Design a protein around this ligand. Structure first.
Ligand SMILES: [Zn+2]
Ligand SMILES: [Zn+2]
Ligand SMILES: [Zn+2]
Lengths: 1190, 81, 67, 435
């Protein structure tokens, strides 16, 4: 069994974000790290949107990311610290649209190691030197300079090592043009290692360390070291030199301290807490991210707290030293992994989970009524600052970026009655969590929809002017009628200006800038913008059958191949040429090539009959009425078209198959893609010419990264379509379904998956699908949280506490502010969940409809109750009722693990999958973490106990139990009699259950400790599964294993387990942790494949190989792309896929799909050893993606 | 016997007697990654000298394919002292 | 021998597991998806998780034993 | 130690001095080094200037800036001003692109020296401007605004080595400018440059050649201007047999001419010298052949028409035939020209192989080795030109020369045989493989 890995959608969560002039122009761009994918994004200053310029899979964990600019330069390079052990300096080339490895300096071993640097990264603000650093012991400084050729020169690494020292955060110091200084937060753990009393850990204070680097002396000196009053998390570089004072801003627990040496005392300002906060008073606020803004005159800092409140920090100096720190509340955004303030007042809030946002900075917050907190005002050192969090005043939301991070559960199912199944994915964390339905295809937004009597068969969008993109009178005709509508500011069904009129027209095309030739079955008239209806008589009495009309040529073919051709005369008279020779049969498809205004005529013309035979000739007058190349297709070509750019001729057959060939005088490389007959038409999507095919399943041959992708559209199944333009739709499609005209427009360019999101309240752990009503039974469990009843009662308790904590005269103001606090409700998804408590939880159960967004039922659990498993099942003792069993841990504290018990709620799922009624609740001793139906009974994993339960009257009856499971059951699978149990640390355990004697007999296991998140079943012997570290393994029982095994003292296993062992037949490191696997088929008519979804927001697939020769070819392709195209971070691809366990029986197609993005000389250099052309290698690479799921 | 300092930008060299040999494991099969050496081992009169004998260097020193597979190229300057 | 975390025939259980825990914490802070998992389990920001793991780096297994 | 020929000796001297400066402080360095500012001996002043530059590298340029401000404007002696400007020049030379944040300050400090009454101060000021410009390449042109009018005026008055230093400064300033000002300025200086083209003193000729190489390599100086204004006097005055007898002038003119062809077009430069391929002076032939080699290796032969092709063929044939020394430059040149022509050398290949066979029958074996090397270099193009019978005859003669006693020539003959077998094939090979 050999597989092949593909990525349908890449990872969308953002770890790091930096801003700078990476393209070298004046506009600023964002570089974001999606984990193992580096992306370059362009925030548009006009429309406010975000365009992803580049995605590169670097095949390694990007542990740090920071950009630097040299002195006097106008371009920004990207410094990447990774798990490769190498520091990589990259430059964006906008001409080739790729990242060039400018520098790759090797210093340590590969992996996220404790002392090999890569985790922490600092730059000098003048770009003179960078410092890479590990968590422990090891800091390296690279001095960066330029030669005379304006290139980049990196020095040898200067060791600034210090053994037995932890690094919290490193950053450069804006000292100006002096010696470059690096600021570190350090901990000295050596005193606490040799102290058994534990007093040293209580007194090991942090040190702010200033490492100076003397460039002339070429060494790193520990210039300054100071103790800190509390442990800080990170540092902000104050812009210094002539721009302002130097020094650092230490962010810490409930305090921010400006610190600088010399005659500067440290200035301490408390972090302001929310006024009447609903969190516990024992907690403290730390800044999660910061974004300095070096303006022309005055700088400021945007520091976001843990709740999500942005604070604007300024420093009142009145000298080179700083006298005051002034914080001020800015706004409230979701919690950001990184914030990037931009020029022209933008702010890219890259949220740590869920969708990212881009806001526009409207105001600064200076001449307003909000109070500004200062460090110079007196305090009693017992009361902090209180601010009232109001909604967005200084920020205007202009864009969002849809991110699937984190995917917590997934299911592939055709719940909507369509042909292809959908991806039902539980996303998000906490109040921003949701459930997203993902469908294949680009999103289509309607502009104007109208209803017309009579089913159309031939409609067109015709404009009276070539320059005017809007159709002046679109001929929306039918087979017998013609409901042509003129479109100006609005569409009105008027057909006075058309030559057809009330007569039906089978074709209406623009033959000139001010003239259009309409070939109705009455005749062909080249009617101009005026009433110049010259109804030219066709050769013979036959009507119009086939039309090949371009902007400079027109061919009308009757029955028998009466190819009446006409070129572009300068006068504009409807005339038919004398070259009208009858062919063997009429052309089912007739098309011409591109006819731009620069060219006098087209270069090609194709006519294909309904007897499965096509011909393509030149459209010039030298090759008129004489074919040049032939095509013996197995099916009759229903339509044909030519799309410019690398032009291609696409012919759609009578079935749902479109063959695309390269533009040539002869037949090119024919690639067939599956897609009612294919009535293909042309359109102008984003300026680029593309083809749209209407069939039983629609298709739109878009060009994303110059790739021919036949992605469908999320719209109504139209019978015909044409390109159109309007005010609401500047580049859209005017289409006709069964008696319904519509205008449809698309927004996203690539759009491999379109998502619709239904919001939730807590973090969704798992959901199951009811097989009868087709609904989703979601469990949402959140740590550190309050249930709504407990949150309301805690708000009431806080109001009752503050009205007596006032305790003086004139309490009307206190009562009215308590009422104003009680009645309001800040949104949890915007202002954060104001919830706290280490032992506290909040869990709900939600039966929800997957089609719409309605929640059918919502059962709110208790305070310290936490749902962790859910299943739906029938029973043998009970009838056809569907029972929902929910496993709940009671008062579970995660660190350290101390569970107070457990419960299993049972519900009868009344009102046909739309309501849960609480029937009973069976208490158990451990967490019932895995619930699975089993042969009419149910299997519950209570800690390390595997219990076969049957449904009783008032409780659940434990009918069988096994306790040879090692640590903790996290998942139970079931096929036939065999039960596959996942341990939290050990591998899958096979249990043979006999219905006789009621015994759960363990008979097999696998010999690897795998922190299995989830499992899946392939057949009776093979089990797939994932890892908590980002791996996917597939294990299989060997043949002729005796499953009928049955004292226990004498009999022993092979190695502390069963006597039979399961062999591993696949292992592959994804790099992003997989939480859902499913053996499904995404497109109908394809073949089954193993789909996995990852916590970073990515969806991938594994495809079995159907032949030895395909496996050998893709093995050789992967071997060549490992060497001739190394990954961008310097990580070895083979060692990255062999991270925790070695790669086995898979071929990574994420590297093999970089063959198309590799340089063409390198492409033919790779492909010459395969004895195939690079088009043939790209055809095989696309064939393995299209013959399986996309 | 190995220097094992932090290597820098200097490229290790081999003499005519050991041209093509892997400095770690002595194998002549499949060179892979260019050898980098510390700055002290390339300072002054030591520049361009053989990383095994200190004699004149005529070719670039390489780690073999087996050494780079086992990440023996990430252990520091392999100049023999 | 100079690499922190390696051991010898006189390595104690406490030092070995302290090395294991520190290696594991640094690995969590390196592997983005591990820290993502941990930040989904509790209801804390990634920065808070990083802070907690860094505070745990001082004595991840508690004070050592005598002799 | 700071003037020793060994580079590492100078690095260690600068490191020791910088450590001394950072241990003792700026105050004692200025107090210590001031009495030697106006010393009569030039080498003590040069040593102090280098020492002050390294001290500036140690403590930072702004720390030493006021001392330079005071010294460069000293009313008491021109020696102090000369030493300060030399300090600025050595700061530039030592720190390279690191001087850019204080480049404006240094230029403002030294710019007054250009109109000083003493000639040496003007010369050292121009040289310091040239060093600062070279170190700042390709940035920092704005910081030179205030220096633009003095130098440009100075070259309309000064002559000799002072004019040479001013023009060198100008030549280093031009590639930092944008297209419009580069065009304007190089049009302003081309008259003085072309006037200095015929100067007898060699250092001036080297400097002006370097300056023309710099200015022709700058964006904004159009190819037609170089064609009409620069190229005729350049080729008329510089390409003479006298300059070919010195190595530095040889190399510099070759690189300058190649950069010129790089900008104005390959054929435009090549057509002006092909006939000199047939000069009787063998050293001149070698110079022109090397020039053609470098030009054609960068750009190819796609720009060469038929007439210039025949001119090239005749020139390389004459140069190869009238050869008395075993020049590797003639071998590589013949090989690269034929291999660059590709299938276009097809009509000329009979006489060419005749000449190779001629050199293959030379009495001295080193000429034979060169001929065999040429065979190996040109076998591929001779194959794609389809002349397999002459190649077979060449294989027969080399096989007849296989009893050669001298090993390097025999090795070259074997390499030529490998080339002949690779191009003709094993079935049609003459002699048979079995022999
Ligand atoms: Zn060394
Ligand atoms: Zn050696
Ligand atoms: Zn080796």
């Amino acid at each position: 069994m050999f597989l092949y890995n593909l990525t349908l959608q890449r990872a969308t969560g953002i770890s790091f974000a930096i801003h700078g002039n990476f393209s070298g122009t004046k506009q600023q761009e964002i570089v974001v790290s999606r984990g193992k994918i580096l992306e370059l994004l362009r925030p548009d200053p006009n429309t406010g949107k975000v365009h992803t310029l580049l995605t590169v899979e670097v095949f390694g964990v990007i542990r740090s990311l920071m950009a630097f600019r040299l002195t006097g330069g106008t371009k920004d390079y990207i410094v990447v610290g990774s798990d490769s052990g190498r520091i990589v300096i990259l430059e964006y080339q906008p001409s080739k649209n790729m990242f060039e490895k400018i520098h790759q300096e090797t210093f340590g071993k590969s992996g996220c190691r404790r002392i090999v640097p890569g985790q922490f990264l600092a730059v000098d603000p003048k770009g003179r030197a960078v410092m890479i650093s590990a968590i422990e012991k090891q800091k390296l400084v690279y001095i960066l300079n330029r030669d005379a050729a304006a290139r980049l020169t990196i020095s040898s690494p200067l060791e600034a090592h210090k053994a037995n020292t932890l690094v919290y955060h490193v950053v450069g110091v804006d000292v100006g043009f002096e010696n470059p200084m690096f600021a570190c937060l350090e901990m000295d753990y050596e005193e606490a290692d040799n102290d058994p009393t534990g007093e040293a850990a209580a007194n090991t204070q942090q040190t702010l360390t200033f490492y100076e680097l003397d460039l002339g002396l070429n060494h790193v000196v520990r210039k300054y070291s100071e103790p800190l009053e509390e442990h800080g998390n990170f540092l902000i570089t104050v812009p210094g030199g002539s721009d302002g004072p130097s020094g650092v801003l230490i962010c810490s627990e409930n305090y921010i301290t400006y610190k600088n040496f010399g005659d500067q005392p440290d200035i301490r300002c408390p972090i302001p807490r929310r006024r009447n906060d609903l969190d516990d008073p024992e907690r403290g606020m730390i800044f999660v991210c910061s974004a300095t803004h070096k303006t022309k005159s005055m700088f400021f800092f945007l520091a976001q707290t843990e709740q999500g409140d942005i604070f604007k920090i300024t420093l009142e100096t009145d000298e080179d030293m700083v006298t005051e720190i002034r914080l001020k509340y800015f706004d409230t955004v979701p919690v950001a992994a990184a914030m990037c303030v931009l020029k022209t007042g933008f702010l890219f809030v890259a949220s740590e989970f869920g969708n990212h946002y881009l806001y526009q900075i409207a105001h600064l917050g200076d001449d307003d009524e909000e109070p500004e907190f200062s460090s110079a005002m007196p305090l009693e050192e017992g009361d902090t600052f209180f601010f009232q969090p109001r909604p967005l005043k200084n920020l205007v939301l202009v864009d969002e970026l849809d991110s699937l991070s984190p995917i917590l559960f997934c299911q592939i199912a055709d719940l909507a009655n369509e042909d292809t199944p959908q991806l039902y994915v539980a996303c998000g964390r906490g109040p921003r969590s949701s459930l997203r339905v993902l469908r294949h295809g680009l999103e289509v937004s309607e502009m104007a929809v109208s209803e017309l009597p009579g089913n159309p068969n031939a409609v067109w969008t015709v404009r009276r002017h070539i320059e005017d993109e809007f159709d002046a009178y679109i001929i929306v005709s039918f087979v017998n009628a013609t409901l042509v509508l003129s479109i100006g500011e609005t569409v009105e069904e008027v057909t006075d200006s058309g030559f057809l009129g009330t007569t039906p027209t089978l074709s209406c095309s623009l033959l000139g800038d001010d003239a259009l030739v309409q070939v109705y079955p009455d005749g062909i008239r080249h009617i101009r913008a005026d009433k110049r209806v010259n109804e030219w008589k066709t050769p013979g009495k036959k009507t119009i059958v086939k039309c090949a009309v371009n902007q400079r040529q027109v061919v009308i073919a009757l029955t028998g191949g009466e190819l009446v051709y006409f070129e572009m005369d300068p006068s504009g008279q409807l005339n038919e040429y004398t070259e009208r020779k009858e062919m063997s049969a009429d052309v089912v498809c007739m098309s011409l090539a591109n006819v731009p205004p620069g060219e006098q005529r087209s270069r090609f013309l194709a006519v294909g009959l309904v007897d499965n035979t096509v011909r393509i000739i030149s459209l010039d007058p030298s090759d008129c009425l004489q074919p040049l190349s032939m095509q013996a297709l197995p099916a009759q070509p229903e339509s044909l078209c030519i799309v410019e750019m690398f032009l291609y001729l696409n012919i759609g057959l009578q079935n749902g198959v479109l063959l695309r060939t390269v533009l040539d005088p002869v037949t090119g490389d024919l690639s067939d893609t599956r897609t009612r007959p294919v009535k293909l038409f042309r359109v102008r999507m984003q300026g680029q010419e593309a083809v749209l095919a209407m069939s039983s399943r629609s298709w739109l041959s878009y060009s994303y990264q110059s790739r021919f992708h036949l992605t469908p559209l999320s719209y109504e199944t139209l019978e015909f379509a044409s390109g159109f333009a309007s005010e609401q739709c500047p580049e859209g499609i005017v289409a006709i379904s069964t008696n319904t005209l519509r205008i449809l427009a698309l927004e996203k360019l690539g759009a491999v998956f379109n998502q619709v999101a239904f919001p939730l309240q807590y973090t969704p752990r798992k959901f199951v699908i009811h097989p009868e009503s087709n609904n989703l039974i979601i469990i949402e469990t959140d740590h550190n949280a309050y249930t709504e009843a407990t949150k309301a009662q805690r708000k009431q308790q806080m109001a009752e506490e503050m009205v007596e904590a006032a305790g003086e005269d004139e309490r009307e103001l206190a009562a009215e502010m308590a009422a104003a606090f009680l009645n309001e409700n800040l949104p949890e998804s915007i202002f954060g969940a104001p919830k706290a408590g280490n032992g506290q939880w909040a869990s709900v159960i939600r039966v929800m409809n997957p089609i719409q967004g309605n929640t059918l039922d919502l059962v709110q659990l208790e305070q310290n109750e936490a749902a962790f498993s859910v299943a739906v099942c029938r029973f043998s003792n009970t009838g056809e009722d569907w029972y929902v069993l929910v496993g709940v841990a009671k008062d579970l504290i995660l660190n350290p693990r101390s569970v107070a018990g457990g419960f299993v709620y049972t519900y009868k799922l009344v009102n046909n999958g739309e309501k849960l009624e609480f029937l009973h609740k069976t208490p158990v001793e451990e967490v019932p973490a895995a619930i699975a139906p089993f042969q009419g009974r149910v299997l519950i994993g209570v800690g390390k106990l595997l219990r076969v339960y049957d449904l009783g009257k008032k409780k659940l009856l434990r009918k069988c139990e096994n306790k040879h499971i090692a640590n903790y059951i996290s998942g139970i699978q079931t096929i036939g009699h065999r039960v596959i149990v996942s341990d939290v640390q050990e591998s899958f355990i096979w249990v043979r259950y006999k219905r006789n004697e009621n015994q759960l007999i363990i008979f097999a296991d696998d010999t690897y400790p795998r922190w299995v998140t989830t499992a899946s079943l392939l057949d009776y012997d093979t089990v797939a599964g994932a890892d908590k570290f980002g791996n996917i393994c597939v294990v299989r029982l060997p043949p002729n294993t005796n499953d009928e095994v049955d004292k226990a003292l004498w009999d022993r296993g092979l190695l502390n387990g069963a006597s039979q062992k399961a062999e591993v037949i696949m292992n592959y490191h994804v790099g992003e942790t997989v939480l859902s696997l499913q053996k499904t088929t995404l497109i109908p008519g394809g073949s089954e494949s193993l789909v996995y979804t990852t916590l970073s927001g990515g969806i991938g697939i594994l495809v079995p190989f159907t032949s030895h020769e395909d496996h050998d070819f893709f093995q050789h392709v992967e071997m060549h792309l490992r060497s001739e195209h190394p990954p961008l971070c310097g990580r070895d691809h083979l060692s990255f896929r062999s991270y925790y366990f070695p790669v086995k029986n898979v071929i990574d197609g994420d590297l093999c799909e970089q063959f198309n993005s590799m340089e063409p000389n390198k492409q033919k250099n790779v492909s010459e050893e395969l004895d195939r052309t690079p088009p043939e290698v790209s055809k095989k690479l696309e064939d393995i993606r299209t013959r399986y799921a996309f | 016997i190995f220097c094992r300092k932090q290597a820098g930008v200097a490229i290790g060299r081999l003499c005519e007697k050991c041209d093509g040999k892997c400095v770690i494991c002595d194998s002549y099969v499949r060179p892979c990654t260019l050898v980098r050496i510390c700055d002290e081992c390339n300072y002054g009169s030591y520049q361009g000298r053989c990383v095994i004998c200190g004699g004149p260097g005529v070719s670039d020193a390489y780690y073999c394919k087996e050494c780079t597979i086992q990440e023996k190229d990430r252990d520091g300057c392999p100049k023999i002292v | 021998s100079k690499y922190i975390g390696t051991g010898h025939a006189d390595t104690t259980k406490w030092e070995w597991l302290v090395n294991q825990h520190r290696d594991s914490y640094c690995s969590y802070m390196g592997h983005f998806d591990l820290l993502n998992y941990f930040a989904i389990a509790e209801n804390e920001s990634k920065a808070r998780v990083r802070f907690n793991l860094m505070e745990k780096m001082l004595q991840p297994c508690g004070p050592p034993a005598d002799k | 130690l700071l003037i020793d020929e060994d580079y590492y000796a100078r690095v260690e001297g600068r490191e020791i001095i910088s450590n001394l400066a950072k241990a003792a402080g700026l105050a004692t360095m200025i107090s210590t080094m001031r009495p030697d500012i106006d010393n009569m001996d030039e080498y003590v002043r040069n040593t102090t200037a280098r020492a002050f530059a390294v001290v500036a590298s140690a403590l930072g340029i702004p720390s030493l800036l006021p001392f330079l401000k005071a010294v460069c404007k000293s009313k008491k002696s021109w020696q102090a001003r000369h030493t300060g400007i030399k300090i600025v020049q050595q700061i530039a030379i030592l720190m390279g692109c690191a001087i850019l944040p204080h480049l404006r300050s240094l230029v403002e400090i030294i710019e007054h020296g250009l109109v000083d009454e003493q000639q040496k101060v003007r010369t050292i000021s121009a040289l310091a401007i040239a060093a600062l410009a070279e170190a700042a390449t390709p940035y920092g042109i704005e910081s030179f605004d205030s220096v633009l009018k003095p130098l440009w005026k100075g070259i309309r008055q000064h002559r000799g080595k002072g004019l040479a230093a001013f023009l060198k400064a100008i030549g280093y300033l031009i590639p930092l400018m944008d297209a419009e000002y580069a065009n304007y300025y190089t049009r302003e200086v081309m008259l003085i440059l072309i006037r200095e083209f015929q100067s007898p003193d060699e250092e001036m000729k080297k400097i002006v050649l370097k300056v023309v190489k710099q200015c022709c390599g700058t964006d904004g100086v159009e190819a037609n201007y170089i064609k009409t204004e620069i190229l005729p006097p350049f080729f008329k005055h510089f390409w003479q047999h006298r300059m070919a007898l010195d190595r530095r002038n040889y190399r510099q003119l070759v690189d300058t001419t190649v950069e010129l062809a790089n900008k104005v077009g390959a054929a435009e430069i090549i057509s002006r010298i092909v006939d000199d391929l047939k000069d009787e002076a063998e050293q001149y032939r070698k110079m022109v052949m090397e020039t053609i080699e470098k030009i054609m290796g960068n750009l190819g032969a796609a720009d060469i028409d038929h007439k210039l092709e025949e001119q090239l063929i005749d020139g390389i044939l004459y140069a190869f035939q009238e050869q008395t020394t075993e020049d590797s430059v003639m071998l590589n040149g013949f090989g690269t020209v034929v291999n660059a022509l590709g299938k276009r050398v097809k009509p000329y290949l009979p006489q060419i192989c005749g000449t190779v066979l001629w050199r293959l029958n030379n009495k001295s074996a080193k000429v034979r080795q060169q001929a065999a090397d040429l065979i190996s270099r040109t076998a591929v193009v001779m194959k794609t030109c389809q002349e397999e019978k002459l190649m077979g005859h060449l294989g027969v003669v080399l096989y007849e020369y296989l009893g050669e006693e001298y090993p390097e020539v025999l090795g070259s003959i074997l390499g030529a045989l490998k080339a002949i077998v690779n191009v003709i094939g094993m079935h049609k090979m003459t002699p048979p493989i079995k022999d």
